[PDB]
């Protein structure tokens, strides 16, 4: 199932919900410990992790360095060791069962820093920083390489992307996307990095493009039906799902599904309520 964690609607949320794309059902599960929006989710060894974000509430706006683990057969959250710094609007990738925490903000500070989490040893350790300061960065894993895509450095919204080589611990800039995208949804489908939606400093976007490593080229595909940034994204059974986000006026509960063989999007459900900035993953 497609799990959605945290998010934001009037305040940061503790929601944990699961969508089943064959029966159209939604399942409510254990509330997050601390409310969170601007976080990212990943699944490592079946379990579900929530990384970074912040608690934007009527009484505070605390950037989070927390990492927390949800077990789908115990329905329980348990805290894991925190990161070195708070990471609001973070991006995460999983290479070889390790969690890479990328970018994000703490207050005014936009991080280029990156750190790796070891689930068998409950430790965080820094790795090499990015070339660029990125918040709202989209992360993907392709051929056990890590891609940081788009985002916001504090001044400019970014179409650039850079690649992290784990066995060399270095970052190389690559071909920039066609579109500037901060808070896009970024994932891997077929063997292309997909970049869906986002914000460019003027408008939310409904366009979608994908990166092919072999040719080092970005090419557009069918646009979503609804402009959105700060969306959740995941691929379930060779199809792309995008969840919620903000269209500049509304918090979307729209869930669109992209079929790569017809290059078609279509709305497959509504979340229980519109929200932005969730973390998403599948298990």
């Amino acid at each position: 199932l497609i799990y959605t964690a945290g998010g934001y609607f009037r305040q940061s949320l503790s929601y944990l919900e699961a969508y089943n794309p064959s029966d159209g059902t939604w399942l409510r599960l254990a509330d997050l410990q601390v409310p969170r929006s601007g976080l990212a989710g990943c699944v490592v060894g079946g379990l579900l992790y929530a990384v970074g974000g912040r608690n934007n509430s009527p009484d505070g706006n605390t950037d989070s360095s927390a990492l927390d683990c949800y077990n789908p057969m115990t329905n329980q959250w348990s805290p894991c060791a925190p990161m070195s710094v708070p990471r609001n609007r973070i991006g995460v990738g999983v290479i070889d069962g390790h969690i890479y925490a990328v970018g994000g903000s703490h207050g005014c500070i936009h991080h280029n820093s990156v750190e790796r989490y070891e689930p068998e040893r409950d430790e965080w350790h820094l790795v090499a920083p990015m070339l660029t300061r990125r918040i709202g960065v989209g992360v993907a894993v392709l051929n056990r390489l890590l891609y940081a895509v788009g985002g916001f450095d504090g001044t400019n919204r970014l179409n650039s992307a850079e690649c992290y080589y784990p066995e060399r611990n270095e970052w190389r800039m690559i071909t920039a996307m066609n579109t500037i995208r901060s808070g896009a949804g970024v994932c891997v489908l077929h063997n292309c990095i997909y970049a869906a939606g986002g914000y460019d400093g003027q408008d939310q976007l409904n366009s979608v493009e994908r990166y092919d490593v072999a040719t080092a080229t970005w090419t557009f595909v069918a646009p979503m039906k609804h402009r959105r940034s700060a969306l959740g994204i995941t691929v379930h059974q060779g199809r792309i799902y995008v969840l919620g986000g903000y269209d500049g006026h509304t918090f979307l509960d729209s869930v669109e599904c992209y079929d790569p063989d017809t290059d078609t999007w279509s709305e497959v459900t509504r979340m229980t309520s519109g929200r932005s900035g969730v973390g998403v993953a599948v298990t």
Binding site: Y8, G38, N56, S182, G201, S229, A230, Y246, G277
Partner: peptide, 9 residues
């Protein structure tokens, strides 16, 4: 509001 995420500033 943040133009990108919608959150209150």
């Amino acid at each position: 509001l943040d133009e990108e995420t919608g959150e209150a500033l």
